[PDB]
Write a protein that binds this ligand. Structure first.
Ligand SMILES: CCC1=C(C)/C(=C/C2=NC(=C\c3[nH]c(/C=C4\NC(=O)[C@H](C)[C@H]4CC)c(C)c3CCC(=O)O)/C(CCC(=O)O)=C2C)NC1=O
Ligand SMILES: CCC1=C(C)/C(=C/C2=NC(=C\c3[nH]c(/C=C4\NC(=O)[C@H](C)[C@H]4CC)c(C)c3CCC(=O)O)/C(CCC(=O)O)=C2C)NC1=O
Ligand SMILES: CCC1=C(C)/C(=C/C2=NC(=C\c3[nH]c(/C=C4\NC(=O)[C@H](C)[C@H]4CC)c(C)c3CCC(=O)O)/C(CCC(=O)O)=C2C)NC1=O
Ligand SMILES: CCC1=C(C)/C(=C/C2=NC(=C\c3[nH]c(/C=C4\NC(=O)[C@H](C)[C@H]4CC)c(C)c3CCC(=O)O)/C(CCC(=O)O)=C2C)NC1=O
Ligand SMILES: CCC1=C(C)/C(=C/C2=NC(=C\c3[nH]c(/C=C4\NC(=O)[C@H](C)[C@H]4CC)c(C)c3CCC(=O)O)/C(CCC(=O)O)=C2C)NC1=O
Ligand SMILES: CCC1=C(C)/C(=C/C2=NC(=C\c3[nH]c(/C=C4\NC(=O)[C@H](C)[C@H]4CC)c(C)c3CCC(=O)O)/C(CCC(=O)O)=C2C)NC1=O
Ligand SMILES: CCC1=C(C)/C(=C/C2=NC(=C\c3[nH]c(/C=C4\NC(=O)[C@H](C)[C@H]4CC)c(C)c3CCC(=O)O)/C(CCC(=O)O)=C2C)NC1=O
Ligand SMILES: CCC1=C(C)/C(=C/C2=NC(=C\c3[nH]c(/C=C4\NC(=O)[C@H](C)[C@H]4CC)c(C)c3CCC(=O)O)/C(CCC(=O)O)=C2C)NC1=O
Ligand SMILES: CCC1=C(C)/C(=C/C2=NC(=C\c3[nH]c(/C=C4\NC(=O)[C@H](C)[C@H]4CC)c(C)c3CCC(=O)O)/C(CCC(=O)O)=C2C)NC1=O
Ligand SMILES: CCC1=C(C)/C(=C/C2=NC(=C\c3[nH]c(/C=C4\NC(=O)[C@H](C)[C@H]4CC)c(C)c3CCC(=O)O)/C(CCC(=O)O)=C2C)NC1=O
Ligand SMILES: CCC1=C(C)/C(=C/C2=NC(=C\c3[nH]c(/C=C4\NC(=O)[C@H](C)[C@H]4CC)c(C)c3CCC(=O)O)/C(CCC(=O)O)=C2C)NC1=O
Ligand SMILES: CCC1=C(C)/C(=C/C2=NC(=C\c3[nH]c(/C=C4\NC(=O)[C@H](C)[C@H]4CC)c(C)c3CCC(=O)O)/C(CCC(=O)O)=C2C)NC1=O
Lengths: 162, 101, 172, 69, 172, 163, 162, 172, 172, 162
């Protein structure tokens, strides 16, 4: 889990000297700022289910053949576990918002993304659309610093997807 | 062939201690390469003819597999030789971040 | 190598659910006193040679068997290792203090220190007593309220004492 | 390495258990994957840097033995 | 890492004699049926990705605890690792198929994989079950005679069953 | 070629062959917020440079009387001048480090090669440690709040490297 | 540790070969300096008690300010530490003369010297001029090969200190 | 890796005090005989291939099952390995004989040779027999007074005997 | 890397003939004065810090513009680099004085050093001046009659002067 | 090449250090041993013709069959090359004596010996027989210590060949 403070500890441990001023004051930036990030994490916690469904039908919408029978969209339990997976992604977004870093995202979901996508013919474009939808909601749900907190991790997630 | 250039592969140049350690399994490939660099034949046949800068060029081509970026890299590397021995140069090269990566 | 926030997220993943708002409150309070712990860590790093020097002085004063010929730190290069090891230990403890979790301490070199000191023949009780000595010296150094704004820091002091004692118990 | 300190090699038993596996999964594999447990022999001069490398790399060592003395 | 010819030569050298005409007869019987073995291995190689996808789908189906958090197979990178393990064990069975010997299987990884899975904590009976079921999935493809000239395939099926079950019994 | 926040960010992004992620620009924002107290401290410390250097020289002589008698390093007008010049160097590079929000100026211009030069010229690190302690005392008064902490971090870093 | 024949065996072992004319000639030249270095070590061991006191007194002479209170030189235990340091240096010089090589002085004194002198705040010039005094007095105690061996080893220690 | 003089110096360091006069006379008496030890080590080196050849001839005359197929030294590579082991044993014994200290031989050559032969299936008793054959050949070549002055070197021959005996006993 | 003996050998081999009695007499005289050569080499080695410090003090008295801001020796890294260069050149001069041939000095030190200094912007005339200052401060020490047997070391003094002049002329 | 002085300098230069006391002791041993070695070199230089001719004749005696037609020894040219090669070996033995190191032999003769002998099918045993003859006559020509030096170098050559 490569979080910024842990990354500080690592990039000092590889060397033989203590934490110099830059490390401490970057930790200071994080320690000042954590409140909006955790605020956005709790906000996305409060709106989890609506984001889940809305992204599900948004991806259903722009790509019609998913709604068509004979694809991954076809299947009631299939769609249920689809919603479960998008809930996983939103949970990881909240995790990263809490961590004040991209560590939790890269630890579980991005690591080996393309291999599992190819193995299970799940191209990243559907999840890209889902995350664009969720970004559209976070645009209105959160304002100020927390808006940026949500948007930066959403963008990192979509960049990893693409 | 990678270190000694295939023309120094002679029974007189053959490091047998390093080979036996390698065959045991007690020696890493990095340590075998370093021991070939830190050998009498490598000093006498490679280091002695060349200046520090041409020796650095040879060692970058043979240990890192890539030619030097420019002459300033030859200059910045040659100081390790000039001040601490080509043994310290070889250790810096093989225990460096680029070789390990 | 996991931060306290990372550790909490790890248990959240273990439960597979979100982080409950109570844990969010705890983490927000941690980030709120992060300024205080950063000041503590800065006081640890800036005074590191002084802490190590005081600890070495009184450790060698209390235990004479190490300096003397045949001692574990006689040959004048074994004291190089002694001072270097003490500095490394205090670096690890400062890392733990900043992270707020011992997991970063356990992951890097707590497991191997015991067995390395077994192989070398270094006695572990001396190292543990040295850890307590640096703990006392660092406590005194961090208590210094001058040059910094006054505040409540007993939680930080308890955390640092627990980290030092945990490291000593790990090696001993 | 001629001096007494250059002597006294040390064997180290290393396991690359999941602490190593997580960091390597994030960074990626450049080489084929080997078995977790192995015995690595290091001289005293390279002993400290080798253990620093092992700990920073995320591996957990099993047992350290003094082959000499 | 031995071939049936290599094993025959090894025994012949061990007894110190030349290769007996019966051993030569059995080697010739193996070699005349070489295209048998090659078609089986090549079909397995070509259809391996579908086999692995089917295997992953089912092992998710019958075994459920893995897919939820906390199991030895929740995370996504852990999914890449599991897919790699099933792929590589299938590949090793393909190697044993082409070589005709299990030494190419037993020596390379089965020796270390035991202590590896003991240290990891992932159950080994689940691994053996997955080996057997992926054997069934690959065997289904191996039946497919279309686009290829028809012939007998029983001996190769027996050898493949022996090798799959040997790998499972080693792991188990 | 210094090691600063922005440049360490750029270097760690380049080494991984990736763009600047959120956390990199994030620490950069921290630095750009940091800069205002740093520039305030550097201004308040460059304005008082001459009095600071003079006091530091006199404090070093007070704390090390023996250097003043004939036959020592401190005897002579020229050694006086070079004491003032060295402390002026230290102060100037501390202001540089404050402005750059990092220890790059100190670690590159003063710290690197410090011990070799001291040894070759038989310069005692304790002289400069006392001078920097005096400068620390005076910047305790000259600076208020954030700026004082920022200046003290770099003066402490210089003192630690001297020791 | 390290001696001349130790270096001979080290070189031969590295090249993976038997001892040759170069190496045996070096061993012969070492065994020819055997007994003069032996007598040098004998002479230094005989007089050590006066030398240690003379050395600490010459140290205080060279740095009068140290003796005054509030410094390292003030304190009876500090006096004993000075005497013990001088005894250590002389003992290892005798060991090196016996061994005909600077190995024991390398691994028992020089190794780790700079960082110890820095961490315990011990000024090296003290020992430099103490060894200078010991050099001056060895100038008169001995003559011949023994005296020049003692001179070389003391000078090597002095150059190590600076 | 030490010489006997370093052994004495290290013992003196362990006991804190200087070398006694008894130790100093012992070291000087050893040293004055060093120009007499150089001829012994030169006799070992200059005749090393002859010693190895004769020892190998006698060793393979005594035991034929090694050369026989299935034997330890049957394959051509394993014969070369045998020859190189005899070479290295003799070389490091000569090293130790020059040093006057047997610790070099144990530290660099004989430290893990027994375990290596245990892992490789080689019978250690055969290696001990080979080392004793090299013992006999080395004594033969050492006693030759041709091209050297006459003298009484009982200490040298007895020391070489002890060194070879320790090596042979260590292997088995 | 050549010394006087290997230089003579190489020239004789180029002529394809044994060494003449004149050459052997020259090398005998060299070996006879070798003890004085060792004295000079030890004087240079033992007094390296003194030589470097005096040369540096004199050089930076003469050429103040080096140590001004914007000079080539201004910061600590550049001053340390200056002193390091002087130590290295003194080291190679002592090597060439022991060997008796300037081949090591020219091949390993001076062969491409002017190009390096030009690429670094370094005043080569200043480096040459520092080398001459080390010459002066060294011949102060080589001529120190105290503690050694008196004799005629004029040839060694000339040889050392030639090596230092060769260094200065090569750099500038 | 490789002499005592050259090994001393190269060992110092590979660790980047000044020549210390052990190195100067080895050099002193070389400078003391130079007199017997130069004496031996002069002795072998004076009698080079007798040594070479006798060595060639000993080679022919040990292997009569080689001088038969179709073999390597038949013809004026082949025996002239025989005398030339023995002259080379003697020259390099004397070079090694003067240099007081096996460097001239290890560089000129031994480096590449197996490849060249196997390429031109030159039996090493011819050269070992010739060197044994030289070894024998050195005992007559040289007495005491110079004999020991010459024998060291001839033995080194012999072991290199065999
Ligand atoms: C938390 C770690 C984790 C990740 C990252 C993860 C991704 C993931 N999604 C999967 C299946 C899936 N993924 C999707 C979602 C896509 N498919 C359709 O095309 C939709 C349009 C589109 C949604 C936008 C669906 C519908 C499935 C079900 C396929 C099936 O098993 O039948 C699978 C196959 C195994 C399974 O979950 O049963 C994985 C591994 N799984 C994990 O345990
Ligand atoms: C980058 C490193 C760093 C610096 C330079 C720093 C100075 C610093 N101290 C502060 C308050 C504080 N400073 C402390 C420090 C403690 N008080 C006690 O005297 C202890 C001796 C001491 C350390 C244990 C405390 C407890 C506060 C108040 C905490 C709060 O109210 O949130 C603040 C915030 C108030 C403001 O905006 O003016 C800063 C910036 N803090 C840092 O983290
Ligand atoms: C990553 C960080 C890490 C550390 C620090 C570590 C401990 C460690 N201590 C060592 C030696 C040593 N360590 C000590 C220090 C102890 N002995 C007592 O006297 C002191 C009170 C006490 C100080 C804490 C000493 C004296 C030695 C020398 C032992 C020897 O020479 O074998 C060594 C051998 C390497 C060397 O000395 O060059 C290691 C690896 N292992 C690691 O992986
Ligand atoms: C030498 C050839 C080779 C072998 C033998 C091999 C097996 C292997 N599996 C491993 C971990 C693993 N093994 C598995 C598979 C298990 N978990 C569940 O899915 C199943 C019940 C079961 C498979 C059917 C998983 C998922 C991991 C990942 C554990 C982790 O990342 O923490 C590891 C630890 C290091 C790593 O994954 O890179 C190895 C070496 N890998 C190889 O390159
Ligand atoms: C590019 C590599 C390569 C392939 C793929 C290959 C397949 C191959 N197999 C052949 C013979 C054959 N191959 C088979 C095997 C098949 N019978 C069925 O049971 C299975 C689908 C399969 C065995 C698992 C048979 C039965 C023959 C006829 C010859 C015989 O066995 O008597 C032939 C000759 C075609 C002919 O008879 O005119 C080809 C090209 N040869 C190659 O060099
Ligand atoms: C065998 C290798 C070895 C050496 C070389 C050695 C020197 C040495 N002397 C020491 C103590 C000391 N030694 C001195 C003596 C110095 N200060 C003044 O008094 C004098 C001018 C000067 C003596 C010439 C002092 C004052 C201390 C106490 C440290 C302090 O006050 O900071 C210490 C610190 C540890 C201790 O002994 O308590 C060392 C390492 N010790 C060794 O085990
Ligand atoms: C540090 C110095 C050093 C030593 C001492 C050394 C001995 C040595 N001999 C070996 C092989 C071997 N050595 C032998 C020797 C046996 N054959 C029998 O005829 C004899 C009784 C006996 C010889 C005395 C054999 C048979 C092998 C091969 C074993 C196998 O392949 O299974 C090996 C295994 C690695 C390899 O050869 O590649 C070592 C390490 N190697 C070294 O680097
Ligand atoms: C360059 C390498 C080198 C060698 C080889 C060497 C040997 C050497 N042996 C000597 C005498 C001797 N050599 C021997 C040894 C032999 N005596 C018996 O025949 C034994 C068979 C055998 C011992 C194993 C003895 C006993 C003496 C007489 C001791 C004495 O000088 O008092 C001498 C002094 C007289 C002389 O030969 O000029 C030397 C220098 N010195 C060297 O610098
Ligand atoms: C990058 C910043 C920088 C620093 C810090 C620096 C220190 C420095 N000071 C020097 C001179 C000096 N500096 C001093 C300082 C002493 N004067 C006494 O009044 C005081 C007790 C004491 C100061 C507190 C002395 C005595 C010298 C002369 C030393 C000598 O040449 O022997 C020199 C040698 C140059 C010369 O000979 O003039 C350096 C390199 N140089 C730099 O480029
Ligand atoms: C063994 C042969 C050899 C030598 C000697 C050698 C010297 C050498 N000098 C260098 C720089 C330097 N050299 C000097 C010294 C000069 N400038 C000062 O003004 C003085 C007047 C003068 C010395 C008397 C300085 C100041 C630098 C620093 C240049 C820089 O850092 O930009 C550098 C490169 C910078 C580095 O990596 O630190 C080398 C390699 N290189 C070799 O391959
Ligand atoms: C262990 C390293 C080593 C050292 C330290 C050494 C010094 C040394 N110098 C010696 C003689 C000498 N040394 C010198 C050199 C001096 N002449 C002038 O005074 C100069 C100041 C100075 C040299 C520049 C001279 C001229 C002799 C006498 C030469 C002779 O008698 O042949 C001797 C032999 C004693 C004698 O001839 O009676 C030794 C051992 N030799 C060594 O192997
Ligand atoms: C560095 C020193 C050195 C040596 C020693 C040396 C030996 C040498 N001898 C050669 C030819 C030869 N040398 C001989 C020697 C034989 N003549 C008699 O029959 C004897 C039995 C026997 C000598 C004892 C013969 C027969 C040839 C001709 C081989 C051929 O042309 O294939 C050749 C082939 C190159 C040529 O001359 O065309 C070499 C390299 N070369 C060197 O550069």
């Amino acid at each position: 889990s490569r979080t910024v403070i842990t990354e500080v500890i690592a990039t000092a441990d590889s060397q033989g000297r203590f934490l110099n001023s830059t490390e401490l004051q970057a930790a200071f930036g994080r320690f000042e700022r954590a409140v909006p990030a955790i605020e956005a994490a709790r906000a996305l916690t409060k709106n989890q289910d609506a984001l889940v469904k809305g992204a599900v039908q948004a991806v259903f919408k722009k790509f019609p053949y998913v709604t068509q029978p004979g694809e991954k969209g076809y299947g009631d339990s299939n769609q249920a576990k689809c919603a479960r997976d998008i809930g996983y992604y939103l949970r990881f977004i909240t995790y990263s918002l809490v961590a004040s870093g991209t560590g939790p995202l890269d630890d579980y979901v991005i690591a080996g993304l393309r291999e599992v996508n190819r193995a299970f013919n799940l191209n990243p474009l559907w999840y890209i659309e889902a995350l664009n939808y969720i970004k559209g909601e976070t645009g209105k749900l959160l304002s100020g610093q927390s808006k940026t907190e949500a948007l930066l991790y959403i963008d990192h997630a979509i960049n990893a997807l693409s | 062939r990678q270190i000694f250039s295939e023309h120094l592969i002679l029974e007189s140049n053959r490091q047998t201690e390093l080979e036996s350690q390698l065959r045991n399994g007690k020696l890493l490939v990095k340590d075998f390469v370093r021991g070939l660099g830190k050998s009498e034949v490598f000093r006498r046949l490679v280091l002695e003819p060349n200046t520090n800068y041409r020796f650095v060029e040879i060692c970058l081509k043979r240990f890192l597999g890539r030619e030097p970026y420019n002459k300033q890299e030859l200059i910045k590397w040659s100081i390790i030789i000039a001040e601490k021995g080509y043994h310290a140069f070889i250790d810096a090269v093989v225990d460096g971040a680029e070789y390990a990566e | 190598m996991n931060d306290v926030f990372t550790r909490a997220i790890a248990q959240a993943d273990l439960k597979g659910s979100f982080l409950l708002e109570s844990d969010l409150d705890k983490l927000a309070s941690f980030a709120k006193e992060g300024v205080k712990r950063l000041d503590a860590v800065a006081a640890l790093t800036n005074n590191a040679p002084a802490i190590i020097s005081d600890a070495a002085h009184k450790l060698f004063a209390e235990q004479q068997e190490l300096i003397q010929p045949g001692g574990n730190a006689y040959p004048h290069r074994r004291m190089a290792a002694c001072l270097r090891d003490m500095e490394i230990i205090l670096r690890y403890v400062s890392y733990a203090l900043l992270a707020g979790d011992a997991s970063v301490l356990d992951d890097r070199c707590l497991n191997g220190l015991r067995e390395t000191y077994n192989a070398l023949g270094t006695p572990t009780q001396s190292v543990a007593r040295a850890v307590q000595l640096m703990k006392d010296a660092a406590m005194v150094h961090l208590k210094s309220t001058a040059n910094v704004t006054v505040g409540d820091c007993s939680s930080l002091y308890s955390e640092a004492a627990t980290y030092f004692d945990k490291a000593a118990a790990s090696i001993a | 390495a001629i001096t007494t300190q250059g002597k006294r090699i040390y064997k180290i038993t290393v396991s690359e258990a999941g602490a190593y596996a997580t960091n390597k999964h994030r960074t990626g594999y450049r080489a084929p994957i080997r078995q977790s447990n192995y015995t690595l022999t290091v001289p005293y001069d390279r002993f400290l840097p080798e253990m620093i490398r092992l700990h920073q790399s995320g591996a957990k060592i099993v047992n350290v033995t003094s082959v000499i003395s």
